Ligand binder design. Structure first.
Ligand SMILES: N=C(N)c1cc(-c2ccccc2)c(CCN)s1
Ligand SMILES: N=C(N)c1cc(-c2ccccc2)c(CCN)s1
Ligand SMILES: [Cl-]
Ligand SMILES: [Cl-]
Lengths: 231, 7, 231, 7
């Protein structure tokens, strides 16, 4: 890879600089290079990896949605193949990013992750990137089941090994609830999961410091916001 | 669209 | 070029789609392909070309400024070569975009542009992209003189061939005033140009339709905003 | 920074 000649520490330093400069494609390339050094990632490094790819794929998803909407309107005056071609171009690039992330998780981040905080983080990421693949899939059943399977494994570990206010556990439950509502056609499961997650976190807030309380309640508010949209 | 986890 | 096999009209269609999707790198690649077909550009097509590259270089300039600031602070604890290396990386990419645009103008947009609206537009663009090169140059005198020369040729044509409210003429004068203030160390020239431009446009507004009045006054407000910052 | 032309 083009980052093979750069020191691991330099790649991490440059990923942080790229984040400050809002250069997320660069940030993702630096973090991919860091992962490919073969060492496990610290908590901060895992978050840099996630931030970088979330921003890259987030721009692709937003663009794909704009183009898919234009395409669907065209299929209700004939303008030729260009809308489909360009939607396909963006779609293929998005799928490539997702495959890259899934490849890093499979070779070899997940298999080396033994602590709950790292293993849950990576399995959640695996669910997330299969979910993004599912958003554009039309194959689709297998992709959905791969997302579900990853989220379910992450949920099982998180419930055994983490308190209900843990921000990773909360963000996992949040994203699995989104999977149920938006991907799996299971709005009742999404609502049930969001409610139970919110309520169990509420009951554990008393154990937290001021700073941890702030971290956990920020994510709980997203569960609440979705429940307001869904009910 | 539903809200997913933030950074 | 990778766009050589795509129809001119399809490239223009896809540039418009890319703009809607906020995919400005794609938009610029499509418009470069369109220019390379060898035909002159319409008013709408010139604006697509400008929008695409302005957004691409604008992101690069914003990132370069963040990195240059970090670098300057480091040179006031020693952290190694990484900040300089990454600033240089972004700088080189920015210079490459500017050279690409300047290359399209030189081969062969400017030489085929005979009408004032097209010739002024392209000469202004030439001034703008040399100005962006000047922002990172440390060579620098020649780059500054190339920007000045392009803007001056554009100004001479615009004053002879366009009314003082013409939006191209106004945007040219605006950007040349920015050149004087930010690049050429000539704040008095910048203030004089902005004031004279604003006043001559004010006196010509009575000739305009409601829609043209809106177009011209929007740009005049930027002249006024700069005058408020500069005085 | 000074304001330049908008799109
Ligand atoms: N640079 C970023 N975007 C983030 C960096 C960290 C971090 C984690 C452990 C120790 C120090 C920093 C984040 C934690 C999650 N909020 S996020
Ligand atoms: N697609 C864009 N960003 C723009 C398209 C046009 C245009 C020009 C002539 C005829 C139709 C459209 C612009 C004019 C400058 N405001 S801008
Ligand atoms: Cl395409
Ligand atoms: Cl670099």
């Amino acid at each position: 890879g083009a980052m093979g000649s750069m020191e691991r520490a330099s790649l991490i330093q440059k990923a942080k600089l790229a984040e400050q400069a809002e250069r997320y494609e660069d940030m993702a390339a630096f973090m991919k290079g860091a992962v490919e050094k073969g060492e496990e990632l610290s908590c901060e490094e895992r978050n840099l990896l996630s931030v970088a790819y979330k921003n890259v794929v987030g721009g692709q998803r937003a663009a794909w949605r704009v183009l898919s909407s234009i395409e669907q309107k065209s299929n209700e005056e004939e303008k030729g193949p260009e809308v489909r071609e360009y939607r396909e171009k963006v779609e293929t690039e998005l799928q490539g990013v997702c495959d890259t992330v899934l490849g890093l998780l499979d070779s070899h981040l997940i298999k080396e992750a033994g602590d709950a905080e790292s293993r849950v983080f990576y399995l959640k990421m695996k669910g997330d990137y299969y979910r993004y693949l599912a958003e554009v899939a039309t194959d689709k059943k297998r992709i959905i089941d791969s997302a579900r399977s990853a989220y379910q494994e992450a949920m099982d570990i998180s419930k055994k090994e983490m308190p209900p206010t843990n921000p990773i556990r909360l963000g996992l439950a949040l994203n699995f609830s989104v999977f149920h509502y938006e991907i799996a056609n299971s709005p009742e499961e999404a609502i049930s999961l969001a409610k139970t997650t919110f309520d169990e976190a509420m009951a554990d807030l008393h154990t937290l410091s001021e700073d941890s309380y702030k971290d956990s309640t920020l994510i709980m508010q997203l569960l609440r916001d979705n429940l307001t949209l869904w009910t | 669209r539903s809200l997913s986890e933030r950074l």
